[PDB]
Amino acid sequence: ERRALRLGVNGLPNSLEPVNAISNVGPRIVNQIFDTLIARDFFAKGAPGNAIDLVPALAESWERIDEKSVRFKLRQKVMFHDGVELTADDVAYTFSSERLWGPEAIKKIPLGKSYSLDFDEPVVEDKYTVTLRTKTPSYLIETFVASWMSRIVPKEYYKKLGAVDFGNKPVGTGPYKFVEFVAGDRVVLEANDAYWGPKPTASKITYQIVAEPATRVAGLISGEYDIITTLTPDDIQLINSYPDLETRGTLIENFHMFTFNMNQEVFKDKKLRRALALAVNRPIMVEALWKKQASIPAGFNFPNYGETFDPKRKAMEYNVEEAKRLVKESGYDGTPITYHTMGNYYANAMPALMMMIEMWKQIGVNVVMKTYAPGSFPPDNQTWMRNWSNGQWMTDAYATIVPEFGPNGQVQKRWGWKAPAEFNELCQKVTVLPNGKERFDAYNRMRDIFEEEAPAVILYQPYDVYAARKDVHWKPVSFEMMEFRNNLSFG
Ligand SMILES: *O[C@@H]1[C@@H](CO)O[C@@](CO)(O[C@H]2O[C@H](CO)[C@@H](O)[C@H](O)[C@H]2O)[C@H]1O
Numbered sequence: 001e002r003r004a005l006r007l008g009v010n011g012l013p014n015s016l017e018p019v020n021a022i023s024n025v026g027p028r029i030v031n032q033i034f035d036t037l038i039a040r041d042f043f044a045k046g047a048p049g050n051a052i053d054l055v056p057a058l059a060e061s062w063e064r065i066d067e068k069s070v071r072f073k074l075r076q077k078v079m080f081h082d083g084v085e086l087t088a089d090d091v092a093y094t095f096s097s098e099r100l101w102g103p104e105a106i107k108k109i110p111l112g113k114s115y116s117l118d119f120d121e122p123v124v125e126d127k128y129t130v131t132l133r134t135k136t137p138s139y140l141i142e143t144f145v146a147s148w149m150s151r152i153v154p155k156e157y158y159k160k161l162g163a164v165d166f167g168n169k170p171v172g173t174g175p176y177k178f179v180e181f182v183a184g185d186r187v188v189l190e191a192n193d194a195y196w197g198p199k200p201t202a203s204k205i206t207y208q209i210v211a212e213p214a215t216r217v218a219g220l221i222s223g224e225y226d227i228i229t230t231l232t233p234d235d236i237q238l239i240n241s242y243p244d245l246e247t248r249g250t251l252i253e254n255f256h257m258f259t260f261n262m263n264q265e266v267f268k269d270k271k272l273r274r275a276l277a278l279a280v281n282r283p284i285m286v287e288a289l290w291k292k293q294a295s296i297p298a299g300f301n302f303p304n305y306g307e308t309f310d311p312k313r314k315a316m317e318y319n320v321e322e323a324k325r326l327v328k329e330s331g332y333d334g335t336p337i338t339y340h341t342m343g344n345y346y347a348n349a350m351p352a353l354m355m356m357i358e359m360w361k362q363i364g365v366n367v368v369m370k371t372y373a374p375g376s377f378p379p380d381n382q383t384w385m386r387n388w389s390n391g392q393w394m395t396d397a398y399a400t401i402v403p404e405f406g407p408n409g410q411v412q413k414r415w416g417w418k419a420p421a422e423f424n425e426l427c428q429k430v431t432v433l434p435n436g437k438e439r440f441d442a443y444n445r446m447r448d449i450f451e452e453e454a455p456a457v458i459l460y461q462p463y464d465v466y467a468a469r470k471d472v473h474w475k476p477v478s479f480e481m482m483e484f485r486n487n488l489s490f491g
């Protein structure tokens with residue numbers, strides 16, 4: 001039989017419902033269970049896992065009709081794992097008001113509306129033809145449909161179970177099907193030999209949580225795991241000393257950050273947020289912890305934005321004396337401020353925090369670490385500072401500044417950021433404008449306001465480091481996922 005793949009992972013999602021699984025740890029599992037209409041081919045034209053090319057997947061072809069609609073022709077006789085044939089009805093349900101973006105969808109997918117485009121209801125023309133559309137102009141439908149928002153779920157099965165139970169017993173069209181989920185311990189998938197695309201090359205995949213990275217490394221060295229995730233560049237020398245192991249790393253389209261609970265009195269105003277931001281010496285963290293491999297962006301601005309990336313933008317500010325003055329002007333009294341982290345779910349989370357605590361002591365702010373267990377996120381009102389990350393999930397600047405930090409987003413609605421009205425007006429403008437000078441300048445003004453307000457502080461794009469047995473052939477992609485289609489072989 002084919003070899004079973006054993007992965008030692010940093011964490012596991014709380015649900016395998018594909019939108020609710022959006023996180024650093026969910027896509028590497030839900031990418032196997034499900035498919036999208038259009039897939040990003042990271043290896044197109046020989047690229048080393050960072051190509052942006054969009055290719056047919058569950059849609060054999062597609063055509064943009066106008067500024068707000070795209071018609072998809074579906075591949076025929078594709079089956080879900082439970083035997084049901086994929087049709088336009090499943091695709092329409094996936095992108096419906098009911099399941100995803102309407103007010104009724106909040107109880108199934110809490111972030112569905114905030115992360116979605118301004119969709120109108122899909123139009124089904126026939127069993128294999130469906131149009132996705134927006135109420136207002138959107139040139140983002142194709143990048144949205146290739147993203148992690150857009151894995152296709154089975155309508156009747158999903159409605160029968162509901163989103164919570166579906167998340168514990170998922171059914172998709174992908175190359176691996178669900179076996180078991182032991183919350184906070186493992187996920188096991190098995191080969192779907194009825195798959196429509198490249199046939200699965202592992203017989204089974206096990207995602208085993210190993211929360212401590214030292215234990216994870218020891219497990220690779222002992223022969224317990226084939227691939228391990230979420231290492232730091234500081235682990236590269238030891239792993240690569242073993243002739244039968246190696247590291248495989250890449251910059252990913254994600255940024256690490258810290259952010260604030262702006263419902264808390266000390267963070268309602270921008271002054272102390274800005275003071276903490278101005279004291280972070282990012283290049284010294286990149287040198288000390290990342291062996292130079294992480295990348296520090298010029299604001300909320302990344303190359304994968306394409307036409308809305310600004311390569312002439314100045315670096316984010318670093319000014320210890322201005323930071324000291326802001327601490328004084330804020331009235332901060334020396335009381336300790338907590339910073340919550342789920343151990344090293346993020347690579348270098350605790351080492352980075354320890355360095356930042358020292359940087360903050362030098363401006364007169366006392367920050368203390370508080371840890372929380374995998375899957376035990378604290379009550380919001382017990383949090384002040386916390387770490388987070390955002391995957392830059394479109395080939396456009398809309399994500400993640402608008403979905404996360406916009407007026408309909410969680411940073412304003414849940415976490416209390418009182419954004420300037422100008423910022424929210426610009427979010428609405430960029431959503432509907434085509435690319436050009438106006439949209440480009442609007443994102444730059446949004447970036448400036450973001451730095452002025454500091455609702456979050458961007459640290460860097462991580463250099464994502466995996467380690468693997470040399471006899472397990474698999475290349476990383478420039479995103480917070482693992483791809484095995486035509487990218488997994490043994491021997
Ligand atoms: O970025 C993660 C975000 C995603 O919603 O929530 C956090 C908060 O700790 O993680 C939680 O959700 C993911 C996905 O279900 C789980 O894997 C974590 O264990 C859980 O804490 C962010 O890390």
Ligand SMILES: *OP(=O)(O)O[C@@H]1[C@@H](O)[C@@H](O)CO[C@@H]1O
Pocket residue numbers: 022023024025388389390391392404480
């Ligand atoms: O795993 P985590 O950083 O919490 O996941 C984020 C998610 O919360 C959203 O911001 C999109 O980017 C990541 O997956």
